[PDB]
Design a protein around this nucleic acid. Structure first.
Ligand SMILES: [K+]
Ligand SMILES: [K+]
Ligand SMILES: [K+]
Ligand SMILES: [K+]
Ligand SMILES: [K+]
Ligand SMILES: [K+]
Ligand SMILES: [K+]
Ligand SMILES: [K+]
Ligand SMILES: [K+]
Ligand SMILES: [K+]
Ligand SMILES: [K+]
Ligand SMILES: [Mg+2]
Ligand SMILES: [Mg+2]
Ligand SMILES: [Mg+2]
Ligand SMILES: [Mg+2]
Ligand SMILES: [Mg+2]
Ligand SMILES: [Mg+2]
Ligand SMILES: [Mg+2]
Ligand SMILES: [Mg+2]
Ligand SMILES: [Mg+2]
Ligand SMILES: [Mg+2]
Ligand SMILES: [Mg+2]
Ligand SMILES: [Mg+2]
Ligand SMILES: [Mg+2]
Ligand SMILES: [Mg+2]
Ligand SMILES: [Mg+2]
Ligand SMILES: [Mg+2]
Ligand SMILES: [Mg+2]
Ligand SMILES: [Mg+2]
Ligand SMILES: [Mg+2]
Ligand SMILES: [Mg+2]
Ligand SMILES: [Mg+2]
Lengths: 245, 89, 68, 126, 106
RNA sequence: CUAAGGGACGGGGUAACCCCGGCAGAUAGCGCACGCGCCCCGAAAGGGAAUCGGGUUAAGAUUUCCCGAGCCGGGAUGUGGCGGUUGACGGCGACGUUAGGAAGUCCGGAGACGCCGGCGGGGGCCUCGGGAAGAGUUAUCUUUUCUGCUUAACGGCCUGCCAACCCUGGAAACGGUUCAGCCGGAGGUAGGGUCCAGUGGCCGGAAGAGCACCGGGUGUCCGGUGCGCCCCCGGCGGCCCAUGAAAAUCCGGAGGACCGCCGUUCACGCCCGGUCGUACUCAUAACCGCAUCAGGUCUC
RNA sequence: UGGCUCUGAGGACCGACUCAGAACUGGUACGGACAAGGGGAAUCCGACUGUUUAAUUAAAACAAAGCAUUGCGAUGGUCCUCGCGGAUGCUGACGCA
RNA sequence: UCCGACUUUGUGAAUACUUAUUCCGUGGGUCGGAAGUUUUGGCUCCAAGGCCGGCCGAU
């Protein structure tokens, strides 16, 4: 046969992400002494749109801790943030929406977003629009914290990891029906070369395991081993169950 | 007048199915509505992009919902964060 | 090109060292005095017949004078 | 009642925006030329510079100099402060105006050397 | 009706190739190439136009090419901030500074 | 100059050819000893120092030659002016005036941006009339039909659209207002002003040119109109789970270390401006399709 | 539905088109050339717009919105690479596969 | 590709350690031990001052 479409994406030739009009990585400011021990005030100057990202980003300006310079940051905006608003980052920052705090400073039940996995990660969890993590419990002995991720999984994180207070802005985006192939075309035009998908049963056997036949049918179970080689691993991969419950 | 039930959704003609048009109607209305600006006190907040809500006159720009200025959970989150902040003291 | 309004300022410009020539152009209305300097050509419009003559006689003797 | 001669103000608009001035005369009702309330002020066009011990004697004499401007200002272009500077001023032509400016410069330079009114001579940062 | 041609070897109607029609003393029509429309100075805190300065291409503001009065405004933050922005900063600078003293006393 | 992207020092891999650029490696240097310190290539449609009119050849110049008139960049140097309350005046103010300190450091703007729909403005063209010049028709009619009646960059003064801004004042019996909107105690209507742009007006250029007539001479003038056409601009509205380049370059600003016969972004004055392309075709015959091929080939 | 002779209405500070009405009149001809839908009643398939076998198949085929399922919390899933390393990823479950 | 053995691979207690190895962050900018700034969409640098180039201010 020939190389299937699932395999060709790893070469990254025509399958690289479309990033020409993106505003830069969204993440916390690098962890430093002022954040580790006190608070630092920045001001929100813009709430802007990032192509390919559902959530709006917030442009924030700080004063550099030891250089006579401005420090401009850009992270995911929590819902309710606005221009001309003072945000505070650090150990002594108040529990308010838009502030960046260590998890040790957030009590049980707090709603947080852009949560670090390692201390100084600048935010790894709950970054998509409308998503958030929940603080479940605190362990002072190990100095770890238990959070609940948007997928439902529990996760143990160091209590020094930073998160922003609130949920990500732009929620409710996927409740609206797209209604048109053209609306889907514009969505993926600024993301990746992935949108119009051809069914494997609509192919020839040279191109896909599902291809061929005098009727469009898979002809073997669509559930496939976790250890199948690339080119063979198509369909439902390592499925514990199928069907609609 | 001009329509008995379609409203804003009449731009779609006969296409996409009646249930889908009725589904999109509430978000089409809400995303094109004018919202109250708490900062200046006027109904001048308009959606600039998904999640972005800017007041026309005072110029404030606010991060909000995709198709409505304030989502329901946003109010609930603010109350939970406020109660946690007070009880923290 | 630039215009000169008062007669005296034309007199000093025609006395400039970099001034090369003066052209006198006669129209049905007035008489134009144009002095070619290094960067600009300066034009002065004299609406009076005798003031044109007095200007003609009072020009610097070192400057070339041409009739157009 | 707080816009009286001797009271310190800040100019908000114009060529001297952000400069500190002292009121000299108040036309609360306004003249016929100026219907609005307005006052004559004497302000600092150039603040005396930072004077430190390490400096030499000639240099610190140069840093203590001030320039003064006289201006009629609408009340709405003035930010009234709580401070007070009294130097007994009690005040048309381009020659009378500049001469009166030089007199106020001598009085204000002398007040600055006294050490008082440190806020008045220390600029504003915006 | 005296149709026209381009006068240089640019053959595409780009924004940098915009022309105008003029009548010459020779009694004919020729193309003259114009300059692209440019924004003037803008205020960063209000977004409004900066008064007193013309709207030119950036290199037409060069000192050898433009007079100084045209380039500047006589006020602090002259061509950078508008009058309303400067008034707000002066008032904010003074009022917050007074609050710092009151915080110290109390 | 940078775009998508390409190459590439060290390092890593590799038998070698060669394959890897973020993996950080004393980064190879910049200002005034002292201070600072986060490679190149890639667009004759993107960004961008500065030119116009008239003439000229067998063949050029749709801006290269000639005539005239400007401009830009760079470099030296005066003469005059301007400032010293050392670093100018005026205006309530918006802001104005050709000048009118300054180092490391720091901050902003322009460059610089989508699609669609009305409306308004400017330029050119078309179109109606009058006057004068020449030509056509003319058995009859036709104060008629046709042609032309021009004004460049650049400089000065005026004007000042649609928005934006300023001062006074204080609004319900609400008012103002668009084709549509919309706007007002966070200050409307009103009154009076500031700025903005023009491909607007007048003057200079410049009638001496060009054109049309008569044999050197005459003329190159006065109006009207518009859901008209093309280009550009302005200002609103709509749309997006789509929000529609970057850098060079230029301008402005914050601060005020440092400095007096020395400063001067002013006017006028002086010198200089490299290399390569430039003819012609651009198509039912100059390109590709074995051709002088009914095909194909991007534009004004 | 032509031609002709009129009439009325709609304005600005003298003008432009439009729209209505009437009389008369021609070998009933008049959107006089040009330009310019044939219509109706049903069955099958595909929702629709889009796409495709350059040079015999334009379709009922492909795509599509909607619906559903699977894997995955980064020490990860999926994929590329001889190797070193790399794409998704300027990404983080309203996401990627 | 999963899985086991050996190698990388060391040390000490009746499972702990850290320096090998691996990963993450930073313009390697306040680590270990002890002693003693919430403000309104504004500015913030190159130290004033004190005491003898030097020390404190800046444990
Ligand atoms: K193969
Ligand atoms: K595709
Ligand atoms: K499909
Ligand atoms: K099959
Ligand atoms: K100006
Ligand atoms: K180019
Ligand atoms: K562009
Ligand atoms: K030009
Ligand atoms: K040529
Ligand atoms: K041919
Ligand atoms: K990966
Ligand atoms: Mg097939
Ligand atoms: Mg197969
Ligand atoms: Mg370069
Ligand atoms: Mg690149
Ligand atoms: Mg190598
Ligand atoms: Mg290049
Ligand atoms: Mg170009
Ligand atoms: Mg030729
Ligand atoms: Mg539309
Ligand atoms: Mg008015
Ligand atoms: Mg002229
Ligand atoms: Mg002539
Ligand atoms: Mg055209
Ligand atoms: Mg300054
Ligand atoms: Mg049937
Ligand atoms: Mg179909
Ligand atoms: Mg179709
Ligand atoms: Mg095709
Ligand atoms: Mg075929
Ligand atoms: Mg066919
Ligand atoms: Mg269905």
């Amino acid at each position: 046969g020939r190389v299937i479409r699932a395999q060709r994406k790893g070469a990254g030739s025509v399958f690289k992400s479309h990033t020409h009009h993106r505003k830069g990585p969204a993440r916390f400011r690098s962890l430093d002494f002022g954040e580790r021990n006190g608070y630092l005030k920045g001001v929100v100057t813009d709430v802007i749109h990032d192509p390919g990202r559902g959530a709006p980003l917030a442009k924030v300006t700080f004063r550099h801790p030891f250089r006579y310079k401005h420090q401009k940051e850009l992270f995911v905006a929590a819902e309710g943030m606005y221009t001309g608003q003072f945000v505070y980052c650090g150990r002594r920052a108040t529990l308010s929406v838009g502030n960046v705090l260590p998890l040790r400073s957030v009590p049980e039940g707090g709603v947080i977003c852009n949560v670090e996995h390692h201390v100084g990660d600048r935010g790894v969890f709950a970054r998509a629009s409308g998503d958030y993590a929940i603080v479940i419990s605190h362990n002072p002995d190990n100095g770890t914290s238990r959070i609940k991720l948007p997928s439902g999984a529990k996760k143990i994180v160091p209590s020094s990891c930073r998160a922003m207070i609130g949920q990500v802005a732009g929620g409710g985006r996927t409740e609206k029906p797209m209604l048109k192939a053209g609306n889907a075309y514009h969505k993926y035009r600024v993301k990746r070369n992935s949108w119009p998908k051809v069914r494997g049963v609509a192919m020839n056997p040279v191109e896909h395991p599902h291809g061929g036949g005098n009727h469009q049918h898979i002809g073997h179970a669509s559930t496939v081993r976790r250890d199948a080689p690339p080119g063979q691993k198509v369909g439902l991969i390592a499925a514990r169950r199928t069907g609609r419950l | 007048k001009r329509t008995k039930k379609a409203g804003i959704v009449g731009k779609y003609g006969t296409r996409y199915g009646a249930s889908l048009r009725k589904q999109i109607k509430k978000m089409e209305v809400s995303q094109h509505s004018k919202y109250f600006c708490e900062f200046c006190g006027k109904f001048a907040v308009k959606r600039k992009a998904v999640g972005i809500w800017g007041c026309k006159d005072c110029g404030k720009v606010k991060a909000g919902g995709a198709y409505t200025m304030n989502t329901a959970s946003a109010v609930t989150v603010r109350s939970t964060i406020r109660r946690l902040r007070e009880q923290t003291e | 090109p630039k215009q000169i309004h008062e007669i005296k300022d034309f007199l000093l410009t025609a006395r400039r060292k970099d001034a090369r020539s003066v052209r006198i152009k006669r129209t049905k209305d007035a008489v134009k005095f144009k002095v070619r300097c290094s960067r600009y050509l300066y034009t002065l419009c004299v609406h009076d017949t005798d003031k044109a003559n007095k200007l003609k006689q009072s020009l610097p003797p070192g400057l070339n004078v041409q009739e157009v | 009642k707080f816009l009286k001669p001797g009271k310190a103000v800040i100019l908000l608009q114009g060529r001297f925006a952000g400069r500190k001035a002292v009121i000299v005369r108040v036309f609360e009702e306004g003249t016929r030329d100026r219907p609005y309330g307005h006052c004559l002020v004497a302000g600092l066009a150039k603040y005396p510079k930072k004077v430190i011990r390490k400096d030499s004697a000639k240099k610190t004499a140069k840093k203590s100099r001030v320039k003064c401007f006289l201006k009629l200002v609408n009340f709405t272009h003035i930010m009234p402060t709580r401070y007070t500077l009294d130097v007994d001023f009690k005040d048309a032509t381009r020659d009378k105006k500049v001469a009166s400016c030089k007199a106020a410069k001598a009085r204000l330079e002398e007040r600055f050397k006294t050490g008082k009114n440190r806020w008045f001579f220390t600029k504003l940062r915006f | 009706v005296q149709r026209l041609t381009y006068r240089k070897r640019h053959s595409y109607a780009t924004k940098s190739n915009q022309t105008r029609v003029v009548k010459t003393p020779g009694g004919k029509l020729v193309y003259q190439y114009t300059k692209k429309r440019a924004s003037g100075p803008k205020c960063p805190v209000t977004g409004k136009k900066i008064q007193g300065i013309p709207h030119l291409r950036p290199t037409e503001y060069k000192r050898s090419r433009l007079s100084r009065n045209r380039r500047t405004v006589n006020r602090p933050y002259g061509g950078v901030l508008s009058g309303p922005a400067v008034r707000e900063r002066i008032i904010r600078a003074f009022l917050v500074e007074e609050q710092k003293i009151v915080k110290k006393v109390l």
